[PDB]
Every structure is written in C-alpha cells, then in structure tokens.
C-alpha cells in the first residue's frame, strides 16, 4: 500500500478489507418479519430529502433509498467503476470490475467480475468513505474519495441529489503505465414508480461541455416522456477533464445482455467507442460509460474527478400525495436537469470537500476525544440522509414560505418523526441544522389542538381508540405509506393520546431548541408557546392520586412502549419535573407572569412528591406500584439529563443523581456482559437482568449514548466513554455484531438486534454539547 500516502484518510474512519467476510454478524430478535439486509453496507451518498444510494464497502450500488421512504437492497451490477492497466512493453492489458462479487444470472457475464481479497480497503468518516486498491496484477496503485456535500449551517448544497468521485492514481513501480479508469451506470429510470413498461421510452444522450480550461462529459440516461410523476427524471455520470487524461464514452449498452457490446472496447485497451446513439429502448435495459485513459510514469500521480447526479423530482407517498423534493428549489422542478446538478459539483468539488474538512476539524483536532469516538459520532450521522428523509418543495399542483421535513423512526416502524424517539435522535439537526429542528417542531406545535374523533383499532389489544385527542401531541407525522404532515398518528399499535411522556418530551425538546441555538430565539418561543401551555395543562389531568404527578396507568402509555409503569414512574415523573421547569423559564422570558407562577407551584409540589415515593437511598425506583417497582432503570433520571443541557440547575439533589448514575454505571452496564455492551434497560437491585419485559432486557443504542452525554456532564468521563465504548464496539469492531450503517435500536446480551436503521442512536451528538 504506497497510496495511502497519496491521500488524507483520518485515522478515526471505520475501516474494512474489500471483500472481507464478518463471522460474527447479527439477526433480528423478534418473531415476526423484520429487516436484515446483512453486513455489506457503507455511508450513504445523496442529500437531505434527495434519496439516497448505498454503495458497500464490496463496491456495489446495493441499498437504493430512492423511493421516499423505502429500503431497498438490491446490487445493480451495471453500476461500477472498472479498471485497465497495461505496462508499456506488454502485448496485453488487465482488466478488473471493481466489486467483490458477480451477478447472480448470466448478465454482464463478460465483464470480469470477483475483484479479489486482499487488494484494497474501504473507509468511511460520513460523509466522505474511501476506496484504495492494492493488487498485485494491478501495478498503478488507486484510490477513490466519494462524498455528497453535506455540511452543518447549509440548506442548499445538502439537498442535492449528488456524489462526488474523486479518483487519485500513483505508479511505484519501474515502467510507464497505461491507465483507464470507466463508470458505468444503468438508465435506472423505471426501478421504481412505474407500474408497467419499465424500461420502455428510456434513452441515453452525451453532453460535452467545452469552454475555456473545462470540458466535462457526461451521459444523461432519461426517458422521451415528459411527464411529471414519481418515476420520471434523468440519471447522469460524467467526468471533468484534467491535464494528461483522455475521455472516451460509450452512450449505450445492454445491461440485460452479456456486456460484450462495452467490455470487448474497454478490455482491449481501456478506450471506448465515442458512440452516441439516442435511440429509445423498449424491453432491453440499457446503460452509458464514460472512462478516461492516461499514462503514468513512475512516480507519477494524477488525480480525475467523476460526479453522479439524479433529478427525480417528485416523491410519492402511499396515500397518494406527492411532492417536490428540496433540491428542485435549486435545479428546477421538470425533472431534466441532472446535468446542471452534475457540473454544479465537477465544478465546485474541491470547495465542498474544504467545506467538510472545516465541520470535522474541530472534533478530529481534539486529542483528548479518542479516535472511536470520532469514528461513531460521525458515521452515526449516516442516518440524517439515510433515514427516508423528506424534505419538500411545494405539493405538485398547489407557493408557501416554510419546508416541511421528516426523518423516519426507522424503515421497520414506518413513522415520521416519533417524538419520543426524536427526544433522543434529534441532536444533530438542533446542534448542525437548527433551521430544520425548528420547522419540524413548529410543525408538532400546530397538531396539538388537531382532534380527530374517528376510531381507529389498536392493534396490540383490538381496543378502538380515538385517532388524535384536543391537547395531546402526536406519536408521529404520519407514514410514507400514508400521508405524511397530513394525517398524523400513522402509529396504531397503541393509543398515543394516553401517553404520559409525549406531552413532557415535547416541551423539552421546544426549550431545548431555543438553549442550543444562543437564547435568542423569542419569536420561536412565542410560536410555540400556546403549545407548551396546552400540553402541560393536558397531562396535570392525568395525575389520578393528587401528588402533582401524571399517573402512569399500568399499561405501556410512554416510549418503553411493553414495559409496564405504574403511578410515579421515575422516568415520567422527571420528565415532568423538567418540563415543568422549563416552562417556568419560557413563561420568564415572555413575560406570561401567571404561567410562570402555575408551573412554578406544579413544580415544587411534584419536586417534593417525587422525591418522597422514589428515592431508595442508592438510586431512584422505577415506578411506586409495579410489581418490580425497585428495578433499576438506565433511564430513571432522562428529565434531569435534559435539564442539564437545558441548563435549568438541579431538579434532584446533586448527591442523589451522582449515585443514580454511579449504580446505573456498576449495574446496568458492568453487570451486563462485563461492560462491553452498553446499558441494559433494566437490572434488579441483586444484579441479574429484570425479566419482567423484553425491553427490560435489552440495551437501546440511543438511550446509552444519552446516559453517556449524562455522566459525561456530571464529571463521569470514564463511565461515559466506557458506557458509550459498548455501543461503538457492538456495532463497528471486529468483535461486534456488524451494524456499521445500520445501527439498531436495541439489542439483547446474546448481541442480536431488533429495528436496524434506527433514529434514536442520532442521541450520541448529545455528548458534543
Ligand atoms: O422500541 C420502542 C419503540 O417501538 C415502536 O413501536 C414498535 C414496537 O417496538 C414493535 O414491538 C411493534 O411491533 O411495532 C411498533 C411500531 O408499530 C414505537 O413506534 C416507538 O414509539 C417506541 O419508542
Ligand atoms: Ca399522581
């Protein structure tokens, strides 16, 4: 490996051989269907409310997150990049895919498939990942940076439906070398969206633009309708030329065929045909090439930069709404505009890679903070773009000033925005794009008075319940299956409207927004504000007893969604008490003195009353009427960890929340698998595993990187960090479970998991604040 040298990979980034099997990997823990789409991921390109595309360490195009909302995983195997090298004084060349593997049927069986073990390895820091090639039959010496730009504080070239491919090639050796360097890509437009004639009316077209010191080329693969629907749009991949490189294409090729039609150019000498043929497919799928070719002398480097853009438009949700994708407020919404979006980045590339290194430096600068956690901390934020995210631009058909967005719970539990889950899971977008954290807040403010008196059946029990309740804030925004922003509580396995954590975790989540982005904030307040009232107001009718607490009914009404609580649970109860609190602070700065005084009496009754029925001596109970009342929960105290960060001062006694933590530490985490798993939920005062709930005895990747963010503020920092290392080496070591990409939300001790793809361990950006 002399490449390496040639680039600047940090040594934080999560590294893999290309084409290394993992032993160890895990599989979901429930009975019923659940997502497992194996260990061959890697970070994700594309931007918010774009799509996305899963390329895999292997190299394939596998996990296509085009369609809103959907987890697809399936290989395209068109979609490569492919190398030839042939030594001066060699009557032959070599050829090579580069992808570890092979089609699984005989298309593209030319094509010389099985890049071999041992020869390259992947990295990734989201959003850059890496590929370096290191193969004895290949004596140039390759490397490929790709990255989409996304960057914190920037609303518009984060959008962008685009990758960057930015190639680095080094001769170490004692001859001249002749080297191409070809991506291929399928005219994808019909892989999803369209119900019948898939490939049909779709066509390949070169655009060569040529000015002063630019020429870039680039294959456009659309189709002759001009419709606008969900299916419809263009693919490009193009190439910037460079001093000492050539560029050849080819415009069309059968990719429902043997391959030959390209390979059979590219093989002999690694140049293709310039053929440029428009001509509308039918049946066959077709696909474009653009290569460049260059020789390097020894010692020489040269670096080529090669885009991929897509402009599909519109996004289309199951109940039939369809919408403008962000990125057209840039590009424009008629779906045949991926060429500009491609210039924009062969263009502009080297300016937005400054840009990622300035967000990264100051965290990969710090050399007290260990390189794992850099590793986590910056491929956790995989999932902002992986998550379904939907980010829209005017519904097609309706201008207004606002866009609505939505990050998903996870692709198992099809929901937007889960407020319980977003308590923990939305840290990035307060601390790295507060703009988008308040709209999706103000959109929870204007549900709170929606009531819907359709009934609905719930489908743990087959009670009928009430859809949305006056007051009561919703479980999510809807599902993608549905209508998402329109039709709220897509959840129905249980009744959100009795929830007793909602209503709190919403108040904190709209103080925390105006703490984390300077105190400055009043006008978000004051949107916001009827709200916080309404949901306080609400939830006080739910203390049954009189102590000043909502009541807990002995039925899983809060997000630990089959774990019983009953009366004043600790987790409700804090969460009440910050609420409270915050709201006391809210009602201060905008001058509401009757507010203030309210909230202010709730508050010390329920301070009191908490304290009363839940301190043990050594921890906080669980709950004051369950059966295992006396359980140690690892989020016993998530309203005093929210106060921290909120700065609203102690709602429990210093002393008492230090030895909370401290048991929590010597329990639920180094009771469980030595440490080295994170913090199971729920462990009995003996030191064996709560049994009483599933939920009791897994780990939540989201809740034990928040109880990291918790010890670390209260001056536990190798509690944090050892408690947050479980969750790092679980899902990115050599000695995890292969989650890398796809973290879950819980796993039990035998390491399997339960929800891949899971907002809530977004909470880990909580230990930045
Ligand atoms: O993991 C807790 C999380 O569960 C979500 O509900 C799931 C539930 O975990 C699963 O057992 C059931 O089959 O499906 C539902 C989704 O319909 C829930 O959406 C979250 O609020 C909760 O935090
Ligand atoms: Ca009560």
Redesign the pocket.
Known sequence: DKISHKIDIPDSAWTIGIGEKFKNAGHPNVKYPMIDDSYVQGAPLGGFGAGTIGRTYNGGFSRWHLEIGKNKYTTVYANQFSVFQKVEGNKDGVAQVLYAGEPENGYLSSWKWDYPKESGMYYALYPNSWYTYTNKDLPVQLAVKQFSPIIPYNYKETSYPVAVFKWTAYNPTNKNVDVSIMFTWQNMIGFFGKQVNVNSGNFNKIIKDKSKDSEIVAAVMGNISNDNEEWNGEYSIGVKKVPGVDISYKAKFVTTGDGSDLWHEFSKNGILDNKDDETPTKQDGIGSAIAVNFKLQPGQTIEVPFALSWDLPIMKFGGGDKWYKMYTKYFGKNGKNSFAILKEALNNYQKWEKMIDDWQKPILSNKSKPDWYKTALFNELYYLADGGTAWENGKVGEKRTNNMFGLL?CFD?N?YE?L??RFYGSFPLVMLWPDIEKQVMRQFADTINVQDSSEFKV?SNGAMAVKKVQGMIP?DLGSSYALPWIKINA?D?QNPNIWKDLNSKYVLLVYRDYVLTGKTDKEFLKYTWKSVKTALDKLKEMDKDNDGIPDNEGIPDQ????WSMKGTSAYCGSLWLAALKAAQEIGKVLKDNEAYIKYNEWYKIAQQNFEKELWNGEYYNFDTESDHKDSIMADQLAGQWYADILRLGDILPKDHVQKALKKIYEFNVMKFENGKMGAVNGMRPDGIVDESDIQAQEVWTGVTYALASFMKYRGMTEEAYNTAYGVYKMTYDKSGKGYWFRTP??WTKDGNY??SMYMRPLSIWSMEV
């Open positions: 719970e539990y929901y889960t319980d889950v489908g479980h959840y396995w997000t630990y969604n089959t939300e819980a339960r929800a």
